[PDB]
Design a binder for these strands. Structure first.
Ligand SMILES: [Mg+2]
Ligand SMILES: [Mg+2]
Ligand SMILES: [Mg+2]
Ligand SMILES: [Mg+2]
Ligand SMILES: [Mg+2]
Ligand SMILES: [Mg+2]
Ligand SMILES: [Mg+2]
Ligand SMILES: [Mg+2]
Ligand SMILES: [Mg+2]
Ligand SMILES: [Mg+2]
Ligand SMILES: [Mg+2]
Ligand SMILES: [Mg+2]
Ligand SMILES: [Mg+2]
Lengths: 103, 110, 56, 117, 142
RNA sequence: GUAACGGGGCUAAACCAUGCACCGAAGCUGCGGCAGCGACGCUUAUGCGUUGUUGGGUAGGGGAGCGUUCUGUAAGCCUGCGAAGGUGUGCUGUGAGGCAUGCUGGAGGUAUCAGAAGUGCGAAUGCUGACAUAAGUAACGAUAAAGCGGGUGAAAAGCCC
RNA sequence: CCCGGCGAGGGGAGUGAAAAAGAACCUGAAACCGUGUACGUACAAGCAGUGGGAGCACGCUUAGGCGUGUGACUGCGUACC
């Protein structure tokens, strides 16, 4: 049994027990988050969306951790032009563990 | 038990000596000595002396077992170079390098 | 006349790929003295093919 | 107050050489060459954070096209049908279903066909 | 998750046999190229050869429109100073019929090592008989 | 050298007209983050929740920082239970950077807040030293010329007879 | 004491906190040159990277698409002043 939901402007196909990394959410570590906009649920049979989101689809998840991703280095350079600039970046994330998928 | 013998500051280019060293790497000491005896190279004479010294060191300082000995490791390193002057035509002078070498032989029963 | 770029250490090794020496492979054993020698050459003691040729 | 530059100069050069590991010949050994290589590499990486997005979408589209044609419809018409049926699944997910759950992909195609009719 | 990638060790390939009698040269070639590359499969991966093996029969009976039987010219250079050689479509069919189809398909395949590997899965025959019965090819109307 | 569609190929996969789909950019939107400049409510050395909007850049102008050596704070503090220097690894900041620690090393180092500069190098056919490449390549300096026996020696084409 | 030409050089023993402090002697960077091990490489064309990515080796963890090394194949890509 898997389901599709949208979180931080992106979509994820998940199943119960799977850990998924999302964009930073404003919830505490031990709290439970519910995603009510489920694009599709497929167990034995598949439930699509006449209109976006299945009628009674709810995905329950527990926040696991908040952190920053690996450092990326931005390099800008203009040859023969006496111009150079460097910058670093670490993107915030939120890991959640899928607990239950409700049809 | 590993036994080492070295000839430091040997008067020969490392490149020339390495040719001979490659012939005996991994061979039994008895076989290695024969190979060196019939190699018509100046470096062969130098390498043979170091090999014989290593065999002697193993027998006297350690626990002998010549029949069991084998050339486990052999390498040649570059030594300090001596700088000389060679007169050329029209008053120009060139530099001559007299290259030396460090010859290391390791013999082991295992 | 002269190079335009410095050859690499890789190309140097590739040229020296054919510079390896060859061992003698086999040493003959004299029938009488039992002394090793280069084939078709006299021994250090003077023996050749069993005969004591040469008085040295 | 005379200032010797040795300690600091060494640290800066080592920093660049550490980022040039894996590079060929002088590019991983000589500072002058290594510096140019490290700069170039960063310039490519900035450009490729954008290109990565283009290439992956292109891949997903190609896989959707193949899977749809197996069910008897082209990619162009399939996308139109999903839009008319108000299905908002994106191409990343569609390509994943096309490979792992072929039954579910067939159901999507039927929904698209019904909307187009 | 990451996007699925085909594994070159687990790709499943099938055998097909196609008859070229009375089929337009170019239009037949595009379909061959698609299936040799594997563009028809949902597991298509640009860096993995996921295509199929295709036997082409009756390569000598392929068709071309217009006046291309006598006007399509195949050029090649030998490498020697003059060395520019030419052959018309009819001449090619007479001497080596298989070349015509092979040349067309090669021009439509990706260039590079992987493209050359894809070309090896194409078996072109001038006649109606092949010797790959052990591979049990399935008829493909394409 | 085909060489006046990029190519294959094409009788449409050409051209004209009409229509509906789709692809397509660092454009626009979505989600997360940072900074500048304005109006706000509070609160005052403000900051948050806000709130609009802006952030390609050479010459060049303005603003804010990092690190190095030296002076005070310092007869303080750290250090033979291991200083500086060297070499790895892990963590960390938007950057110059910082911190911790294994090994080497074997005696110095220095917080904080201030002060002063021989204060930062890839280029100048820069200067000095070290080491590469060509390369085990050219050459070994008059084309008067050598051969053999013995001696000595670890070894003799070159020394002695 | 041992090998070696009553050599050069080295291996032991001994001194010393330390000899990888042995006189070519504090510390001992880089260029440059080697030996060993893992992976790649003999039908494949270009600033040698970058984005994707299989397989193999070695750790970890009961795998858990982890970590480290390598990098077949593929998109893009003509150094710096
Ligand atoms: Mg003169
Ligand atoms: Mg191309
Ligand atoms: Mg885009
Ligand atoms: Mg924009
Ligand atoms: Mg600006
Ligand atoms: Mg410099
Ligand atoms: Mg010679
Ligand atoms: Mg030459
Ligand atoms: Mg010559
Ligand atoms: Mg002379
Ligand atoms: Mg001595
Ligand atoms: Mg020293
Ligand atoms: Mg080449």
């Amino acid at each position: 049994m898997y389901a599709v939901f949208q979180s931080g402007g992106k979509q994820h196909r998940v199943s119960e027990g799977q850990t998924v990394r999302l964009e930073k959410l404003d919830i505490a570590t031990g709290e439970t988050v519910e995603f009510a906009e489920v694009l599709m649920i497929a167990n034995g049979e598949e439930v699509k969306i006449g209109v976006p989101f299945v009628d009674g689809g709810v995905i329950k998840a527990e926040v696991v951790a908040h952190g920053r991703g690996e450092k990326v280095k931005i390099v800008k350079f203009r040859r023969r032009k006496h111009y150079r600039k460097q910058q670093g970046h670490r993107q915030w994330f939120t890991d959640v563990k899928i607990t239950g998928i409700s049809a | 038990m590993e036994t080492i013998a070295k000839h430091r500051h040997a008067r020969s280019s490392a490149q020339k000596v390495r040719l001979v060293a490659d012939l005996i790497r991994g061979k039994k000491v008895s076989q290695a000595l024969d190979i060196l005896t019939y190699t018509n190279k100046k470096a062969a004479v130098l390498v043979k002396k170091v090999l014989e010294s290593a065999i002697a060191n193993a027998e006297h300082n350690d626990g002998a077992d010549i029949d069991d000995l084998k050339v486990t490791k052999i390498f040649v390193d570059e030594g300090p170079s001596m700088k000389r002057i060679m007169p050329r035509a029209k008053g120009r002078a060139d530099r001559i390098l007299k290259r030396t070498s460090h010859i290391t032989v390791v013999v082991s029963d295992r | 006349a002269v190079q335009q770029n410095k050859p690499t250490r890789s190309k140097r090794g590739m040229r020296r790929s054919h510079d390896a020496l060859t061992a003698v492979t086999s040493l003959s054993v004299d029938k009488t003295s039992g002394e090793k020698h280069l084939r078709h050459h006299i021994t250090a003691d003077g023996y050749y093919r069993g005969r004591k040729v040469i008085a040295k | 107050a005379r200032v010797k530059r040795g300690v600091i100069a060494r640290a800066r050069h080592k920093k660049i050489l550490k980022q040039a590991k894996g590079y060929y010949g002088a590019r991983s050994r000589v500072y002058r060459v290594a510096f140019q290589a490290v700069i170039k590499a960063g310039q490519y990486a900035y450009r490729d954070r954008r290109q990565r997005k283009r290439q992956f979408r292109q891949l997903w589209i190609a896989r959707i096209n193949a899977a749809a044609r197996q069910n008897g419809i082209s990619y162009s018409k399939f996308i139109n049908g999903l839009k008319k049926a108000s299905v908002e699944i994106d191409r990343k997910i569609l390509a994943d279903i096309a490979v792992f759950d072929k039954v579910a992909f067939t159901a999507l195609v039927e929904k698209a066909k019904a909307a187009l009719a | 998750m990451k996007t699925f990638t085909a594994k070159p060790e687990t790709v499943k390939r099938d055998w097909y046999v196609v008859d070229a009698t009375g089929k337009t040269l170019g239009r037949l070639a595009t379909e061959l190229a698609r299936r040799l590359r594997g563009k028809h499969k949902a597991e298509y991966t640009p860096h993995v050869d996921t295509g199929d093996y295709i036997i082409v029969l009756n390569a000598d009976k392929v068709a071309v429109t217009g006046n291309k039987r006598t006007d399509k010219v195949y050029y090649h250079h030998t490498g020697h100073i003059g060395g520019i050689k030419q052959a018309t479509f009819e001449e090619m069919i007479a001497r080596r019929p298989e070349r015509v189809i092979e040349i067309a398909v090669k021009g439509m395949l990706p260039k590079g090592p992987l493209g050359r590997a894809m070309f090896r899965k194409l078996k072109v025959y001038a006649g109606n008989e092949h010797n790959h019965a052990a591979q049990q090819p399935q008829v493909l109307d394409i």
